[PDB]
């Protein structure tokens, strides 16, 4: 069935943070607080911050999964278009069908769910590096929102779950995602309509 998108900070006070990048033409990845929507270029570095009041225990894991936002498409699996699925951009870890990848982490793990056929990517939770107040994961989105035979101009949600080493839910949060050539301009345009 459709995975839960309900916000849950839980014991460890789990919330997401984003860089305050602005909307300059030369931006690759920008977050809109007003929309709670990320704007990112294809395959480019997408920083998502993990904020906690208390450090989760050893072997805590952080899962990312994309779902369609619209009620009628929610039961459909989010996957890459046949073109992007075929193109030789493989990192030698990520399944070629998977929209979401993590870069700069050789403990990354990918799941085709045997029951739901859902795609997700999981990394170990590492406490904030000295002189930081959050943990940063670098996500990569390997299809454009406009891809015919993929998302095809349908809005998606990314759901970020915090789970312990035995797979118990510790926390959940979500943000809308648009993968597009001009993230800056598109945020400015989508914010214009307010
Ligand atoms: As991004
Ligand atoms: Zn595509």
Tab-separated table of C-alpha atoms and ligand atoms in Angstrom:
chain	number	residue	atom	x	y	z
A	1	UNK	CA	0.000	0.000	0.000
A	2	UNK	CA	0.959	3.763	0.055
A	3	UNK	CA	3.795	4.544	2.552
A	4	UNK	CA	2.996	6.989	5.450
A	5	UNK	CA	4.118	10.659	4.944
A	6	UNK	CA	2.952	11.823	8.452
A	7	UNK	CA	5.554	14.083	10.214
A	8	UNK	CA	6.963	12.415	13.410
A	9	UNK	CA	9.918	13.961	15.358
A	10	UNK	CA	9.733	11.187	18.031
A	11	UNK	CA	12.128	10.607	20.989
A	12	UNK	CA	15.272	12.090	19.307
A	13	UNK	CA	13.425	15.278	18.125
A	14	UNK	CA	14.038	14.459	14.426
A	15	UNK	CA	13.593	17.257	11.811
A	16	UNK	CA	15.113	18.103	8.364
A	17	UNK	CA	17.218	21.227	7.605
A	18	UNK	CA	18.254	22.735	4.224
A	19	UNK	CA	20.983	25.180	3.031
A	20	UNK	CA	19.690	28.789	2.483
A	21	UNK	CA	21.037	28.773	-1.132
A	22	UNK	CA	18.940	31.599	-2.717
A	23	UNK	CA	17.709	31.546	-6.383
A	24	UNK	CA	20.747	32.957	-8.327
A	25	UNK	CA	20.874	31.582	-11.947
A	26	UNK	CA	24.127	29.686	-10.993
A	27	UNK	CA	22.452	27.660	-8.118
A	28	UNK	CA	22.285	23.816	-8.528
A	29	UNK	CA	20.011	23.046	-5.492
A	30	UNK	CA	17.670	25.491	-3.601
A	31	UNK	CA	15.010	24.854	-0.870
A	32	UNK	CA	11.704	26.843	-0.549
A	33	UNK	CA	10.431	27.104	3.086
A	34	UNK	CA	7.098	28.701	1.921
A	35	UNK	CA	6.385	25.633	-0.337
A	36	UNK	CA	8.477	23.067	1.705
A	37	UNK	CA	9.750	22.101	-1.807
A	38	UNK	CA	13.350	21.387	-2.996
A	39	UNK	CA	14.480	22.476	-6.535
A	40	UNK	CA	17.485	20.432	-7.852
A	41	UNK	CA	19.363	19.900	-11.184
A	42	UNK	CA	19.628	16.323	-12.637
A	43	UNK	CA	22.302	14.115	-10.907
A	44	UNK	CA	23.709	17.170	-8.967
A	45	UNK	CA	24.489	17.279	-5.175
A	46	UNK	CA	21.255	17.710	-3.089
A	47	UNK	CA	22.165	18.377	0.599
A	48	UNK	CA	19.521	17.288	3.213
A	49	UNK	CA	20.377	18.050	6.905
A	50	UNK	CA	19.355	15.793	9.865
A	51	UNK	CA	18.622	17.766	13.107
A	52	UNK	CA	18.197	15.874	16.467
A	53	UNK	CA	17.785	17.071	20.119
A	54	UNK	CA	19.444	13.760	21.283
A	55	UNK	CA	21.923	11.439	19.408
A	56	UNK	CA	20.256	8.168	18.245
A	57	UNK	CA	21.995	4.912	19.363
A	58	UNK	CA	24.633	2.989	17.317
A	59	UNK	CA	23.404	1.394	14.028
A	60	UNK	CA	20.654	4.032	13.438
A	61	UNK	CA	19.782	4.227	9.676
A	62	UNK	CA	18.328	7.032	7.442
A	63	UNK	CA	15.978	5.936	4.575
A	64	UNK	CA	14.930	8.119	1.561
A	65	UNK	CA	11.881	7.130	-0.612
A	66	UNK	CA	10.063	9.152	-3.360
A	67	UNK	CA	6.213	8.972	-3.742
A	68	UNK	CA	3.839	10.896	-6.098
A	69	UNK	CA	2.068	13.763	-4.192
A	70	UNK	CA	-1.283	13.498	-6.118
A	71	UNK	CA	-3.897	11.072	-4.589
A	72	UNK	CA	-4.617	9.275	-7.945
A	73	UNK	CA	-0.870	8.492	-8.656
A	74	UNK	CA	0.209	7.721	-5.007
A	75	UNK	CA	-0.101	3.878	-5.471
A	76	UNK	CA	2.264	4.067	-8.539
A	77	UNK	CA	6.019	3.341	-7.910
A	78	UNK	CA	8.318	6.392	-8.481
A	79	UNK	CA	11.088	5.144	-10.879
A	80	UNK	CA	13.352	6.552	-13.672
A	81	UNK	CA	12.135	6.858	-17.330
A	82	UNK	CA	13.221	4.045	-19.738
A	83	UNK	CA	15.820	6.497	-21.263
A	84	UNK	CA	17.571	7.477	-17.947
A	85	UNK	CA	17.222	3.777	-16.829
A	86	UNK	CA	19.216	2.779	-20.011
A	87	UNK	CA	21.903	5.584	-20.000
A	88	UNK	CA	25.441	4.623	-18.742
A	89	UNK	CA	25.518	6.823	-15.555
A	90	UNK	CA	25.692	3.795	-13.123
A	91	UNK	CA	27.912	4.352	-9.992
A	92	UNK	CA	28.226	0.520	-9.548
A	93	UNK	CA	25.988	0.581	-6.396
A	94	UNK	CA	22.586	2.139	-7.378
A	95	UNK	CA	19.952	0.052	-9.236
A	96	UNK	CA	19.410	1.758	-12.639
A	97	UNK	CA	15.590	2.069	-11.994
A	98	UNK	CA	16.163	4.132	-8.753
A	99	UNK	CA	15.362	7.919	-8.879
A	100	UNK	CA	17.192	8.682	-5.549
A	101	UNK	CA	20.946	7.955	-5.021
A	102	UNK	CA	23.424	8.915	-2.224
A	103	UNK	CA	26.996	10.037	-3.199
A	104	UNK	CA	30.222	10.053	-1.086
A	105	UNK	CA	29.095	7.101	1.145
A	106	UNK	CA	30.336	3.506	0.418
A	107	UNK	CA	28.005	2.136	3.207
A	108	UNK	CA	24.943	3.122	1.034
A	109	UNK	CA	22.249	0.376	0.601
A	110	UNK	CA	19.331	0.134	-1.924
A	111	UNK	CA	16.014	-1.778	-1.456
A	112	UNK	CA	13.550	-3.069	-4.061
A	113	UNK	CA	10.754	-3.906	-1.520
A	114	UNK	CA	9.623	-7.530	-2.248
A	115	UNK	CA	5.993	-6.701	-1.117
A	116	UNK	CA	5.415	-3.033	-2.235
A	117	UNK	CA	8.000	-2.923	-5.139
A	118	UNK	CA	8.987	0.496	-3.605
A	119	UNK	CA	12.526	1.916	-4.187
A	120	UNK	CA	14.409	3.398	-1.164
A	121	UNK	CA	18.090	4.250	-0.333
A	122	UNK	CA	19.446	3.941	3.282
A	123	UNK	CA	22.773	5.072	4.901
A	124	UNK	CA	24.106	4.717	8.475
A	125	UNK	CA	23.304	7.731	10.739
A	126	UNK	CA	26.626	9.481	11.664
A	127	UNK	CA	26.536	12.213	14.395
A	128	UNK	CA	27.252	15.833	13.270
A	129	UNK	CA	30.989	16.292	12.371
A	130	UNK	CA	32.825	18.557	14.919
A	131	UNK	CA	31.911	22.266	14.372
A	132	UNK	CA	28.459	21.316	12.919
A	133	UNK	CA	24.947	21.073	14.519
A	134	UNK	CA	23.443	18.652	11.888
A	135	UNK	CA	24.324	15.579	9.728
A	136	UNK	CA	24.294	16.216	5.911
A	137	UNK	CA	23.371	13.486	3.335
A	138	UNK	CA	24.210	14.323	-0.351
A	139	UNK	CA	21.249	12.990	-2.449
A	140	UNK	CA	21.305	12.621	-6.294
A	141	UNK	CA	18.037	12.681	-8.359
A	142	UNK	CA	18.688	10.783	-11.655
A	143	UNK	CA	15.475	11.822	-13.574
A	144	UNK	CA	13.940	15.250	-14.458
A	145	UNK	CA	10.302	15.955	-13.300
A	146	UNK	CA	9.449	16.588	-17.037
A	147	UNK	CA	10.608	13.047	-18.147
A	148	UNK	CA	7.995	11.470	-20.522
A	149	UNK	CA	7.598	7.789	-19.412
A	150	UNK	CA	8.760	8.723	-15.858
A	151	UNK	CA	7.351	11.387	-13.447
A	152	UNK	CA	5.971	13.190	-16.590
A	153	UNK	CA	5.318	16.634	-14.927
A	154	UNK	CA	3.734	15.001	-11.789
A	155	UNK	CA	4.850	16.382	-8.371
A	156	UNK	CA	6.691	13.919	-6.010
A	157	UNK	CA	7.330	13.879	-2.218
A	158	UNK	CA	10.667	12.599	-0.789
A	159	UNK	CA	9.974	10.861	2.606
A	160	UNK	CA	13.044	10.764	4.975
A	161	UNK	CA	12.611	8.145	7.784
A	162	UNK	CA	14.897	7.620	10.841
A	163	UNK	CA	14.888	3.900	11.923
A	164	UNK	CA	17.021	1.852	14.427
A	165	UNK	CA	19.241	-1.194	13.498
A	166	UNK	CA	16.175	-3.583	13.814
A	167	UNK	CA	13.973	-1.413	11.490
A	168	UNK	CA	11.719	0.362	14.085
A	169	UNK	CA	10.426	3.871	13.066
A	170	UNK	CA	12.217	6.579	15.192
A	171	UNK	CA	11.163	9.635	13.097
A	172	UNK	CA	9.648	10.733	9.733
A	173	UNK	CA	9.705	14.002	7.687
A	174	UNK	CA	8.922	14.920	4.024
A	175	UNK	CA	9.515	17.640	1.367
A	176	UNK	CA	8.200	18.073	-2.227
A	177	UNK	CA	10.905	17.584	-4.951
A	178	UNK	CA	11.232	19.116	-8.458
A	179	UNK	CA	14.207	17.965	-10.635
A	180	UNK	CA	14.727	20.739	-13.288
A	181	UNK	CA	17.471	22.500	-15.371
A	182	UNK	CA	16.902	25.973	-13.737
A	183	UNK	CA	16.182	25.412	-9.985
A	184	UNK	CA	16.588	29.139	-9.044
A	185	UNK	CA	14.118	30.538	-11.662
A	186	UNK	CA	11.542	27.719	-11.017
A	187	UNK	CA	11.504	28.351	-7.189
A	188	UNK	CA	11.092	32.137	-7.879
A	189	UNK	CA	8.186	31.349	-10.333
A	190	UNK	CA	6.429	28.823	-7.971
A	191	UNK	CA	6.851	31.308	-5.018
A	192	UNK	CA	5.537	34.184	-7.282
A	193	UNK	CA	2.042	32.516	-7.103
A	194	UNK	CA	1.411	33.373	-3.373
B	1	LIG	AS1	18.494	19.689	-4.476
B	2	LIG	ZN1	14.320	10.498	-17.053
